[PDB]
Amino acid sequence: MTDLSPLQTRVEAGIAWLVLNRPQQRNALDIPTLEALHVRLDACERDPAVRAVVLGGSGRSFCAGADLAEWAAAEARGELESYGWTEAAHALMGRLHALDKPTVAAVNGSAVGAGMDLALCCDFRIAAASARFKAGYTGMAYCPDAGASWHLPRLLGSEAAKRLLFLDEAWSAERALGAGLVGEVVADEHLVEAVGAFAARLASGPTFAFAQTKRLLRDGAGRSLAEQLRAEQAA
């Protein structure tokens, strides 16, 4: 039972569960949701209790993307230029992607556009069989492709990323699993149990070493092997 918080947060045994909680809107991303998760993520980094972070959706869908109704209100009347959704989303994507704790995305349902980009910023992705994935061209709209064009080619290769972006069809959890979009697929009934077990052994490990390792993985993409070895001879 929710208390109208935009983001339901619970911390159990070193695992911080951050669940999007607008199930009626399929957990559509709006500025209140963006900012709330953005501030709660900063609290998780500083908190010594949390050693792993889970990002999940409520109800049938993980996240349907940007809230078109909120965008409509700014567009239809008043300040469309003062609407700061893109600024709030890009700050959130950057922080989650570089978070110093191990992060897991529990794709309980469909992830679309910015909703899929939110899962791609996590280190791991476990998806339910019902989960469906949409990006770029939807058939009726075109999602923001900033983070998709950065994440998708790195996880899927260039061609596979262009099939998902340019074609309007959604990908199933099986197809996402086979293409490398998600790392693991479980039945929807066992998803919360599967994520908890996976996040538990992540939480049992040395969080400090994971933080340094996660920074080396990210920094290593832009430097040669010799540079990477030089950089690790320092701290």
Added chain:
Amino acid sequence: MTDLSPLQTRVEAGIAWLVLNRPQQRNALDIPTLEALHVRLDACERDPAVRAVVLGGSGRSFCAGADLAEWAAAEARGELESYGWTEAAHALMGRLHALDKPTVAAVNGSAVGAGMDLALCCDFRIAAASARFKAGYTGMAYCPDAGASWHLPRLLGSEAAKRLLFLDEAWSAERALGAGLVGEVVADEHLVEAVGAFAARLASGPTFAFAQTKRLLRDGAGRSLAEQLRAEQAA
């Protein structure tokens, strides 16, 4: 029935078909072919009618690579230094790879060396079952490895790319499909039909959004996620 054009071009329903047309030479690449496709590609970018581009071969083979006979004539007598094949090929590879329209390579037959590099510059690759792929060491010769050494590790991973380049064996369409070299494999009888259907739904989508997305995919490979998000807050 051909009209001696080095490149047979037809535009149907927003799809520009560019077919190499030297079937006797297995569509070997020479300066006339390089330049013709090079100029026709520039016309496709500017043309609002074309919304997808197909690159195919004639007869049994997609492209056997550089025309050794043309190179022999320049080598055997006269100006081997004035031979500008490498300059014409590198200009073509760069333009095709960065083309602002969705590009599909219909690998109707074997692609060797620069012929394979021509297909790698396309966004998508659909191959017939008869198609065979050769790169680097052939057993009797060594193909230009400039574009291969750039494309192959990005599509196949380092080791798989080195197996194809250092070993003289050709890869089948099945092996190319499994390694990520091509995205789809169909029977040779259904190849033209399969490419047309795939290029049709690409042509039905928003071409303008694909152009911006294709530029973001390419630019995103050289910058971090935070930089990519900064860059997309501008146009």
Added chain:
Amino acid sequence: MTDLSPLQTRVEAGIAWLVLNRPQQRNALDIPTLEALHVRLDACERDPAVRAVVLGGSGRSFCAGADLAEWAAAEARGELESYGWTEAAHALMGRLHALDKPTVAAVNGSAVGAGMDLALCCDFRIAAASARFKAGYTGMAYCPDAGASWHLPRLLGSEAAKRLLFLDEAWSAERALGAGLVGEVVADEHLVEAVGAFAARLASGPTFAFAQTKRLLRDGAGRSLAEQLRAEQAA
């Protein structure tokens, strides 16, 4: 029968076999082993006889990683700061990774930490079915992650590399094969025979062209396609 050399070296038919030879320590890496392989590798580059290089382990294991006993002696008494193991290892990893000859890693047994990093610096990896792979968190210790954080995401993708580093479980030869960690898996009884046959056809090819190609593959990762083509119009 060994002669107490830290590294057993034999050169047959253009193939230089470099076998770690401390089977009692599971071929644990210490400064004498690091330096010996480091100097022998430099001899292989200069030697025109060797056209392919094989790196193997002795006995049951390929390499168990850094020698903890040697580190203990420096730590327990005397000069832990003067201990130059990291410096010797990083010089070895850099040279092997950029070696001008084709290199093959014969993973005869388990490779752990720096031992796995040694195989990742080779161009090819053929593993026995008994081979097991450990990286990062072991359950009781945490291996150096400098080269792992550089190699593993490039071979396995980000998520798969983080599963191997953050989870303490080892990967089997089958799982390593399926994830792209090794290129080929054979029975332990046929490993030496399989590596010899693979290294033989590598040794039969044009070694000079492989050297230029191997440099282009490595340099191409940091530049665009247009830059790569500009660079190959020169030597």
